[PDB]
Design a protein around this motif. Structure first.
Motif, PDB file in Angstrom:
ATOM      1  N   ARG A 209       0.808  -1.237   0.000  1.00  0.00           N
ATOM      2  CA  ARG A 209       0.000   0.000   0.000  1.00  0.00           C
ATOM      3  C   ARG A 209       0.838   1.283   0.000  1.00  0.00           C
TER       4      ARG A 209
ATOM      5  N   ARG B 238      -5.077  -0.430   8.219  1.00  0.00           N
ATOM      6  CA  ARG B 238      -6.453  -0.789   8.594  1.00  0.00           C
ATOM      7  C   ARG B 238      -6.629  -0.963  10.110  1.00  0.00           C
ATOM      8  N   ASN B 239      -5.717  -1.695  10.752  1.00  0.00           N
ATOM      9  CA  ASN B 239      -5.836  -2.024  12.186  1.00  0.00           C
ATOM     10  C   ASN B 239      -5.222  -0.985  13.137  1.00  0.00           C
TER      11      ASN B 239
ATOM     12  N   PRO C  36      -7.447   3.971  11.956  1.00  0.00           N
ATOM     13  CA  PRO C  36      -8.293   4.167  13.138  1.00  0.00           C
ATOM     14  C   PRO C  36      -7.886   5.372  13.994  1.00  0.00           C
TER      15      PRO C  36
END
Lengths: 45, 75
Positions: free
Chosen positions: A7, A33-34, A38
């Motif tokens: 990415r 993502r994790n 967030p």
RNA sequence: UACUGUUCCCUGGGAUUGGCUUUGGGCUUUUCCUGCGCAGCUUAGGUGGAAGGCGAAGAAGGCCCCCUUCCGGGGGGGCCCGAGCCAUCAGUGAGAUACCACUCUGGAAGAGCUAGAAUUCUAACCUUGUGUCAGGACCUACGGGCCAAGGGACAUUCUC
RNA sequence: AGUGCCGGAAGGUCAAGGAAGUUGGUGACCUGAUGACAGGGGAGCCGGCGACCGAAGCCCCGGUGAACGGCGGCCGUACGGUCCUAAGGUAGCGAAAUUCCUUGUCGGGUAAGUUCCGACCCGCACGAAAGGCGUAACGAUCUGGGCACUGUC
RNA sequence: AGGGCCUAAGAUCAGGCCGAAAGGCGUAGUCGAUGGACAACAGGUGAAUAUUCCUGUACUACCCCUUGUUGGUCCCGAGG
RNA sequence: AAGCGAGUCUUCAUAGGGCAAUUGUCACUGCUUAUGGACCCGAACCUGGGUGAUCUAUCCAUGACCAGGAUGAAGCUUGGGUGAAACUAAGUGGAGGUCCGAACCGACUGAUGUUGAAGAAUCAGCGGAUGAGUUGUGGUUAGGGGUGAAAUGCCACUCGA
RNA sequence: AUCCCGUGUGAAUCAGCAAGGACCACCUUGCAAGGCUAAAUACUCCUGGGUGACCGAUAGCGAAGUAGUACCGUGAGGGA
RNA sequence: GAGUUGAAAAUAAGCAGAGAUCCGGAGAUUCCCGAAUAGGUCAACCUUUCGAACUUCUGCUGAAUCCAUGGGCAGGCAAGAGACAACCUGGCGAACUGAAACAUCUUAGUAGCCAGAGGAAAAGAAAGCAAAAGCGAUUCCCGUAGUAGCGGCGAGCGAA
């Protein structure tokens, strides 16, 4: 067969290890993502 | 219910065959999951049941792009 | 302990599914060594551009340590020294790593390439609370939000 | 020993999955003799074949019988010889709810007892938790004998 | 005697979870006596009813009025 | 088969050999054949979807029941007896899947009954009868099932489904 | 081959993409991953109109009479 | 336009040329149960506070957190719900049978259950056919044809 996830991560926070508040370095989607996106520590290109 | 709310994916019928062709029937289920997602505006957890391909679609087009195609939102 | 299957369960590949770190795997290039049946100055695998390289782009011999070692004697850091050493020649099935072209054996430093690890981390994931949080009121009533505690990318779940 | 179960190095065997390489198809484009198609054949795109890596299981190694199970022949004078087997039945009990031959034989019980009791052991083919052997009590239990009693006769 | 009170076994179950559909689990509640809680007896009568009608003598629950106290009521924390 | 055609295939490629060198069609009616239940009647079964625990098997919640009569446990008390325990005589006591025996629940033997009075009874006797007891009401479990102090027994005169 | 699906991957945009029964080349045809749409077609608890080499009370609907009645079954259900 | 007050038909009292009884179109009423819907229930009853319960419409509000969502209170002719012979669309999906047995196969995507909707429903306007000649969305009949095929190359199945 397997495929590596690559990415296009731009930064925001300093980051304990690899960051600049302006890197264009690449990692797996598990970081964005994790952990980061967030907390709001980075963005996607 | 074995249904992803985003992709609309169901389980599939399959006469899973022996070496000798003495068939049965079973369901190839969807690879669902209970997992938290991250909303753009709100910036909260969203505790949803999604497919694996649902994740791919969300990472492709941001939640609200996908979530308009399944009317219900704001949990 | 009939044939064929189905299920329970176990095991691997793949998704969920992330992160550093050291140790000793395989493969790819640079460069460097290495590789003593018998002739015997030769710890030389096969073959080859074919006869001057190299030296004062600071030399023969040597001081002491380092690499290799089938212990025969190779290879080499610095320098007192101070600019020589030497190729066909005679022994061999082959000629001298004097220059240099191409590669087998077996190995030393860097670079890439992935993979196998063990540990931990935590943010996914799993699990806990007579911990707290309230609508007109309760949750020591299921659950919900919030801090938290313990596991931890295993486990669970899907597919093969 | 066999099977089951439990545990265990290295080696073999070993799927899906990758994976260095081989070989084919098609074909721009060069080419080949009289017969009407024939050689190649770059790139791309297709399909096959796979040196190596690849777990559990299984073989392999140990332990376990109140785990499934199993507990011998032949020949000579209690005593020996010899073979096979994982090992050859210990205690106890034994003609029994097991016994075929069979109403075994012996003793008791009766004038007379293929049933009954005790002993023998030639246990066809008992046997130690599919327990072995005993045991006071209890039985609309089976099976023998007596007294009393009677139309059972 | 039951219901207008209460709950057990059990049932159904808002929101909640899970499932091709039908539905399954399950809390809050709500039902559900065979149980708890509650106030009447004799005599009399009559073709057919009587603790029900008659006569006597009772008891429970409400609305009057005399004194009052300032709040009641529900939720709610206890005794029972 | 390309293909050739009054021929063609077979083969160096002939000779030989095979197969060819021709002939109606549409109805109606019958006879058979085929497909549908197919000449008629007749299974035990299999599968799907429903209905049943007012009978019976287990359990649950709530109530109810067990005349009368026997035996005499542990403990305790008072003596006897000990350094104290132990032990032992009498009282007291009311245990027990205790005894005898009605209701209650069963079903061992016989006789009767056999187009029965009854699709399991009557009669005479039998076992338990304070418990692993009986029973009313209201519920629970369902057939590739349930339930079973286990016979494949019971699950509405149906049960190897 | 074509069409659709679980798992994992994962394009291109008319110098394109897909099909033409693996597959490649050349031709030809079409434009997938957004929708809507009358007719001709299927049937009869049923209404009106017509017809019958159909039945005539053991036939014809089970049912010519107040039949899904009487009756049986806990019940689904059977059934004159 | 002449006699009526349902069927069986009797009585009693009425209504009828100022036009009944009747026939047609449109309206009004419609106890209780039943989607059942104020709450409960053992359908046709009981309790009430007299109420379309529940959901999306629409007005306000204000939870655990700002916004928001859950929730509460309101107005509402208020859309939905249930029923329905076959036909039809979608979901699940048998077995007996045939193969002279039987597992591939056949029975069949049939029977059954479940959900849904109409007078039909579904399909449907080419990423389609076809062959160098052309056709122009579906759907239905005749036909091609029991041909091309598929098939333990068996039973059978069978297109365009």
């Amino acid at each position: 067969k397997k495929v590596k996830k690559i990415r296009k991560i731009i930064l925001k926070e300093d980051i304990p290890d690899l960051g600049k508040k302006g890197q264009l370095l690449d990692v797996r989607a598990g970081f964005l993502r994790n952990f980061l996106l967030p907390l709001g520590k980075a963005e996607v290109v | 219910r074995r249904i992803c709310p985003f992709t609309g994916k169901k389980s599939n019928k399959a006469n899973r065959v022996s070496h000798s062709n003495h068939k049965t029937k079973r369901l190839q289920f969807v690879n669902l999951q209970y997992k938290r997602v991250w909303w753009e505006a709100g910036k909260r957890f969203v505790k949803l049941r999604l497919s694996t391909k649902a994740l791919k679609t969300i990472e492709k087009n941001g939640l609200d792009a996908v979530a308009k195609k399944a009317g219900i939102d704001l949990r």
